[PDB]
Subunit: 498 residues, 4 copies
Amino acid sequence: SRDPASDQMQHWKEQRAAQKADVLTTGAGNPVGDKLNVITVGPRGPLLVQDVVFTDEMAHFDRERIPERVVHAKGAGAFGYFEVTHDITKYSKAKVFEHIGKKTPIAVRFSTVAGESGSADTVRDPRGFAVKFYTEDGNWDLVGNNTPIFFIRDPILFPSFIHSQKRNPQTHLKDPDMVWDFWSLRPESLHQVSFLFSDRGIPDGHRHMNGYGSHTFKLVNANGEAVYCKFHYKTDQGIKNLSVEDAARLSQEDPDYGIRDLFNAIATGKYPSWTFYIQVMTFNQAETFPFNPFDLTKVWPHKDYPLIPVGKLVLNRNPVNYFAEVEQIAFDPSNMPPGIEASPDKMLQGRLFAYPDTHRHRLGPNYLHIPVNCPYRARVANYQRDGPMCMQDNQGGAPNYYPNSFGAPEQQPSALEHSIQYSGEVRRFNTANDDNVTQVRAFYVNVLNEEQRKRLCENIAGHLKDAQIFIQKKAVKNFTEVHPDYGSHIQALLDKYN
Amino acid sequence: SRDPASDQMQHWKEQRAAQKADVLTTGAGNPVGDKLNVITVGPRGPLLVQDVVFTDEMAHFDRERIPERVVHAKGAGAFGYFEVTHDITKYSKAKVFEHIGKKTPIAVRFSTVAGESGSADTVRDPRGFAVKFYTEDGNWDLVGNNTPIFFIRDPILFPSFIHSQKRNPQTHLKDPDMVWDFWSLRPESLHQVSFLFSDRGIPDGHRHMNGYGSHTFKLVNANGEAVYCKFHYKTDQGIKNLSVEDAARLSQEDPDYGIRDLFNAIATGKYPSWTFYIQVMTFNQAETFPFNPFDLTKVWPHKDYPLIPVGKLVLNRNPVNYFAEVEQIAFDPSNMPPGIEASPDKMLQGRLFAYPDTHRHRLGPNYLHIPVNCPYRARVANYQRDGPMCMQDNQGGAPNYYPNSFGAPEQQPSALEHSIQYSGEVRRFNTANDDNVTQVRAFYVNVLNEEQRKRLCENIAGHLKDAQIFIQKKAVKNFTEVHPDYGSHIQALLDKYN
Amino acid sequence: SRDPASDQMQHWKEQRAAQKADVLTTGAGNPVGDKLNVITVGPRGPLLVQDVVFTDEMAHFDRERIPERVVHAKGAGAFGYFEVTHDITKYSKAKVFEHIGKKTPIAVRFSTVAGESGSADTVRDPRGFAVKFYTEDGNWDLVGNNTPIFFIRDPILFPSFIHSQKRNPQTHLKDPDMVWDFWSLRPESLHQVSFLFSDRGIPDGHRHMNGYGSHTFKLVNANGEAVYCKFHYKTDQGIKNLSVEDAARLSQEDPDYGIRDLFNAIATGKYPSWTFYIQVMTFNQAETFPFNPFDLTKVWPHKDYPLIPVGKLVLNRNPVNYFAEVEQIAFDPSNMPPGIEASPDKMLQGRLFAYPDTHRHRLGPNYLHIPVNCPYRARVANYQRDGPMCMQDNQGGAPNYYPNSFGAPEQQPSALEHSIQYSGEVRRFNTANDDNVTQVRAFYVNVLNEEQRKRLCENIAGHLKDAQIFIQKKAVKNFTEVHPDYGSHIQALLDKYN
Amino acid sequence: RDPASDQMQHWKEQRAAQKADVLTTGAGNPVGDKLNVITVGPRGPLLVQDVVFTDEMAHFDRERIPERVVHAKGAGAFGYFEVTHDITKYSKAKVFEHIGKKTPIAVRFSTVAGESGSADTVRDPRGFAVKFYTEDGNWDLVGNNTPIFFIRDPILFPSFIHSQKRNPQTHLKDPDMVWDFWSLRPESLHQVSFLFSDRGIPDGHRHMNGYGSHTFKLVNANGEAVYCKFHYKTDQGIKNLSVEDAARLSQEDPDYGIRDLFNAIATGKYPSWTFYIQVMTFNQAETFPFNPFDLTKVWPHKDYPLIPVGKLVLNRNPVNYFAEVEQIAFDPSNMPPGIEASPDKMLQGRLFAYPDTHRHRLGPNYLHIPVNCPYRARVANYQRDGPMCMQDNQGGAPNYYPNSFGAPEQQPSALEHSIQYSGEVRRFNTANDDNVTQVRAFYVNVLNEEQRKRLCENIAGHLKDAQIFIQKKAVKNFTEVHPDYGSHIQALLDKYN
Ligand code: HEM
């Protein structure tokens, strides 16, 4: 016996001691007499349409694949629970937080960003850390990253950013000119670029990295009072990264390093956990904040906004079938129960639309019917009907229009959203110049030490060297605005590669 | 109170007397505060993306429709059971017939052919009568209709026939030139055309017509001996048709006459039933038969091949949700359990492919996952996996390749199909010139009386009059070959219409 | 020869004197030797998979259908042009209006609302009248109908309203309880319900009805000044309707009356046209209007807001292939060129989202690539790429991200939208209690005469009689609120029916 | 830098005195600002009326289509096929009508088991599909870089692929799955020997051969038929990558094959292949020692010499990868008059699968996609409608056959060649056909000691991770090929173990 992941089939076989193997059938349940030979007219004759056993199986094989996620395609998944450890009901009325000790089942999927389905785990790229909370008030999806910020602050630039991070439209090759032309033209990315090219750019698996909601969200309590917040989930396994060299070696030796690591950890009882926190900022404090509290390229300094403990995230169950439970799982940031709402973060606002929209495409109109996506701890009752692959009773004969006089589902007033008064013109406000350096300089000078700065620069230069000179200059010009020693160190490294 | 159908919502309401209305939720189960007004900026301001309650419902509304059936789009469904009354185990070893008194759950769908989803029920058109038997050896789909024969004998002509029966490609109107140009050019249609234009052309609802498998099938017993057969299911309600005038009036008064009739009959306890029979022809008889026993335009004379009683079909349950149970139901002629197999009928052979093929398009790759299509009385175990909208557990962590040394499903020797010897050239054999008039003449002459023949002719002439003169002549020439009186009477009526 | 529609095939044949038919090929262009018989082993043997000609054709046949429109499924289409006859550049800078005499190609589709694809044309229901203008500034879709108003004033009730108008989820039959439970519970529908059950409820074809954009839209001129407007296109053939008896008779005789009528009119040179007008309201006037100027259930009195002539709409070309040019045509209200914008009408706002959304489902992600939907008089250049059935060069090797330093497409500042400053909280504002009777009373009293009010009441009572008494009472209560005579007349008729 | 890297720069340059196009929405409406969304106030929520944003975002959300069930990772190119010799005595297909005749072609090279973001330089067979756009329609020769395959019956294909891919629970490559299947189905011995040899990892796509693999049927002008094999030998020469170098490249450049081919064509180094055929008469098909339609068998060159026919030349790169490569579709059933199938069970199964999988991956009207459209033939038939129906949908032409209105007619000269058969319509077992003879000829005569050593090391290196009982079964099969083959692998396994 090797690692648990390797022994998957052996264990499956063993669990079935009373080896009476099931009868092999067609999709419609008809028993198959011989699924090892096709029907022909005579030993060396042609194949007949009459062989439905063949067609039935082949037609399905021909349809096994579904579109991969447009971003975050390569990932790993696990399941467990969320347990409340502290009382934050003064901030939020959400049932998931109602009592200390209350557990809510969770589903999680970790992932890289740019790489497709057959790409390596151990590569520099941010990491996805999505959490699905199956609450009594429906599903709550906290779709986070392993960073508290992001590259851009306006959603209309997201498709372009992702395009620049992927393959050239003609050559289908990664293109550093694309990567850096966009980044140098859009210096808002300076903060996240700095995080990305640091040591945490390549975590040692999924268990040794933090998780963040990134966006600023809104919490509403029972009295209707609201505050803005941030979600943080620190790894109880401690931060641990892979060196550029080891990451390179592993991407070849085991492209599925992250998947294997997580499966084996759980299989052997080493269940990973994260301590769940929140930062709180009142509406009054939001007015005085030195930056836009809804700018996704900014963090809320811990000094001024201390982490407030809330609970724990524990992963103790591996998927039984990867496609059904991981590949098909869908997280929608808009899935929020009463007590948790969205903030005016332009980026968050854009995601409110994007996720359900893309899910209806890659999964299907009724993707919420898929078991792993089904809000099984809440009764779904509404006036929505039909659609492709309607896998339930489609709500039977219940009246399908609202309002009605026949006893069908009623709206619950207490669930109404929190209302705020906004003022200003309805138009496109430019945010390209919303301070792209202040917090980046703080990160460079105060958070990192000498060794870490040297590596950051070496990592940046190592990739930037392949972009054209004019792109290198504009990129260095941006790093120099962050801190003159930051830009010059990179320029020096570039000079020698050139 | 009116008919049961009208009181659908009222009864639903009453059945929930001592209950509180459910909470209206989003698709993800999040309670909704107000689903009667959208979120806007101020009383007369723009709509916000934040209103995910709105877009969650709208998006689903936008995706309610799926493609209708390419043919037989307009229909009605009901459920019940099939009961064995006689012992035919000497002919077939199929479990569905294993013992007298055995009941098997069934699902049925009645329909017209050419009309789309919003067409009228009472129109001259053959009628679909598909029966799905949920047996222990998988689902057995007997996709029959109200006639023992069909218009053509080769499947490669089916798409063309259907096109001719539907709308003109440019105008989108019914086109009698298309209809009769095809029928006149393909005289093998004379038999079913004669049945269609007779009184049997417009049944009084679905309960007053017979059901037939039409094709010749093959039965195999426990010793491996096989015979050919026909499936017949005669109405216990008695044959009742509608007159041309009544059918036209009803098509305007109640386009859903068949749906209502069936629903009300079942809702009032008047469960419709059919007596199930089979005709048997030994391989030896198949050789001496005057025509091609596998020619779909020919019947097996009752005098030479008597009906052998087998059982009863009873419909005692209305669907609860039409879309999920009727619109989404899928019957595949290729769905046959051990003991029942296909025959070399060219038409049936073509149907072995078309149905699951159109179902993978209409419903989706995993259409067999939809409840009503699921072979719930059987255990589905194989090596098929994944695909869009994959429900259930996708067969867990079971070994996905065959053969394997890990205890996964195994083929069952007893399920092996019956072998028949064939020899000859592998090519396209013309069947256009097979007998196209003999059996038709017997029908025109003996099966029908003088009064019925008159109507047949005026029904034909009534529609044919709108086709060009050259098409009329060609069609009349065909009728004249069946019987001089047949052609002359039609020509006489055409003469005055013209 | 008969009418042009009937002679479609004949004319096609004729336009080919030297009738040497083209060679019959597979989808891949391989010539077919015999498409009338399939390949079998021996004259009475089984079908071979080797018969690719069969499968190729059958497989396409099995996939001919696509989902019908969720609403307005039944319709007809035609093509022509829009011609500017008057100068309104003082209100709008849109290129389509830039100069008197300017001609822009248009596409139009007329339709009913509730019935499915095989339903009748001559039924009571509003009528769709969508116009696609292929301008140099892209496509402009004015998705109108034959009434200036609608049943509801908030988009979130649309799915429910439509459900109440269609079939019972269990019985699949039209349900008057659903129809009237909804309408009586939402009296804002009184205005459009009064219009619907009036003579204009069943137009005599599409050529004899008016067109209206219904909603309030916004126009912006070169100076950046804006005004609100209404779009009107009056029938030059004059208003003409069908009596209840004639409409009923025709729904039986010719379910495709509207299609035939339109086709034959254009085919014989009787090209229908409409005079295009607009009503203009200043932002100042919008502040003093007695009702909400953006309420879909209200009209702008002509006395206070006169029609201002703009141009002509002429349909002079029939479709060559219905499926390709009509069934697949897609109109998006959000398709507006510079100079034409949306207003804060909650209903319009909702439609901005719904159409493109439903089109991505019904047609596909790249539905704009379908010839009839392609903005062929404009150059499409952006950063959108890929997606299923990408039928173009996919913009070749052009840089796929914005911004970029490589010459890819740039935004055009002059196209920037008009900006307004709105005030108030961001929440759901209830409009259920806005004025629901005032304009309706005027309609009943002034717009109609004694003779018309009599028919109106009979039509309403004729359908309402089949709803339960409690629903009849609630409905009459609302009608009475509009005018005593209105309610008492319906009740009197209802009394005899009951 | 290499041409590949300068893609955007060259694009910019080709548009010297041009001026950028106006950025528009999908519907052609000019865009004023596509860098900021519409909000109420500088810090307010997003509005639904920002259709510029939705139009773009909704499309981004739909960019992905399912990848090929197999052969997902690949590279494409275009060029022509030129006839150099006359084989019209064997086939009447227009593509071979005269010396010098050039026909446009589309080619896609690929691996097999890996998904879209996987490495090019890994052990795996290679796909070498060729689409010939002929006057008689498209001819798709969907080949591999091997003349044989692992199995001989199509019903085992889904299982084989499954064993080559990821474990259903762990989503990891599983050597138990790989070897349990191969050891249980020894017919795979021949192709497994090819796979684990030096040619298991070619140096790019230009340094490998292509084969149609299956036995096909050629019919000439007087309706006479013979069986054949298609072979296309690399004019650049066979060149492989060592295991160490392949490993390094898989990390250094997962898109090595793509880059190599692109730059080669970009710099004028147009790769070519010499196209040949092998011919076997119907009589020789009777005398052949094995089943001539058995995919695990080759026709010895000594008895069936390579007959030269023409050249395959790749001289044009894709302008848009998604459009010309990701969306390209090859159907083995696409054969013009003069070229037919043979009773090879594997080929017969492919006749169904490809068009079938294409209707799912691309769509019902996938043949309407430019790269797949048979542009050098007039398509005319009775097929209509379907999703994303581009074109005129054949206009108002009569849609039923037969008709009296002048619509398309069948052409009698296009009829298939008929053969006589006799037998029961049943499932005949082929699991026990010869699984070792030709394999032995490969191990003994074709390879030398260095190569046999490398072969055994390659096999043991991977086989070592499977359970012992699987190892023994595998070794048992290799032993049946040659004692020295199994003993050497076992000795290496003893060591790794
Ligand atoms: C406005 C910008 C954004 C847009 C439009 C966007 C869009 C998307 C889309 C379309 C997907 C694929 C969804 C699927 O197919 O299941 C995706 C996945 C993902 N995104 Fe975002 N994204 C944005 C910002 C972000 C940010 C800021 C975060 C982190 C807080 C994030 C985290 C993720 C994660 C974790 C996944 C993978 C979920 C999974 O494992 O299934 N994205 N994103």
